[PDB]
Design a protein around this ligand. Sequence first.
Ligand SMILES: [Zn+2]
Ligand SMILES: [Zn+2]
Ligand SMILES: [Zn+2]
Ligand SMILES: [Zn+2]
Ligand SMILES: [Zn+2]
Ligand SMILES: [Zn+2]
Length: 252
Amino acid sequence: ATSLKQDADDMCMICFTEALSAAPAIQLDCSHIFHLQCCRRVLENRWLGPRITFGFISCPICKNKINHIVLKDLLDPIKELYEDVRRKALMRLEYEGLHKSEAITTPGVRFYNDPAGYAMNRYAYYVCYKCRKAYFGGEAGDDYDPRELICGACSDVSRAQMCPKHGTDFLEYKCRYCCSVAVFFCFGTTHFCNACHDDFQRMTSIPKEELPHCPAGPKGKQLEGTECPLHVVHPPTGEEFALGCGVCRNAH
Ligand SMILES: [Zn+2]
Ligand SMILES: [Zn+2]
Ligand SMILES: [Zn+2]
Ligand SMILES: [Zn+2]
Ligand SMILES: [Zn+2]
Ligand SMILES: [Zn+2]
């Protein structure tokens, strides 16, 4: 009968190729045992891909959070980042008026009475290369350049007007090529959403007057209707545009 119960002679379920007995091992709070150095490397290496996520801290066996006293030096800065993203995500959800969504208010569902968890799941945050702050990159591998994840404040090509409440703390730009929030800033000049960035050769090559007009989907998609997915008036597709304060924009 196939069981995930650990044996003395088992392989480490991070590295797979060496026995737990072959190098120093720790017993995590969840009860599972791993090499010390493997646990350390996992916490150093963090998440896969540009979006800030926290699945990497899951025990490979039971998926509970990895925790041990000797890992506190690596876990502390992760916890700090977690709390910063969670705080920002929740605030964005509240300012969007989405914190009483049915996915939060219905007893028994995954995010019941957990608006901050809902928001972390809903929204994609990124680390700004320049200021090191987590920034919002829209609603949700390692073949990317971390130096091209830059927040709106740090890529402020239009010298946008300040938010009276927030300054530039939540300043965001659109994708140059579609009605989406920017993730990447390339060439020192150009904002891209993730999808347009994936097709950046084609997108930068399309003659400007042939780009889709608002409402524009990524990768040159002409959407139907006359309502901008960003709910703002903006210049023609193919021009940079500061969306202003990402939390105040909703209302303003
Ligand atoms: Zn190992
Ligand atoms: Zn475990
Ligand atoms: Zn920044
Ligand atoms: Zn785009
Ligand atoms: Zn638009
Ligand atoms: Zn604001």
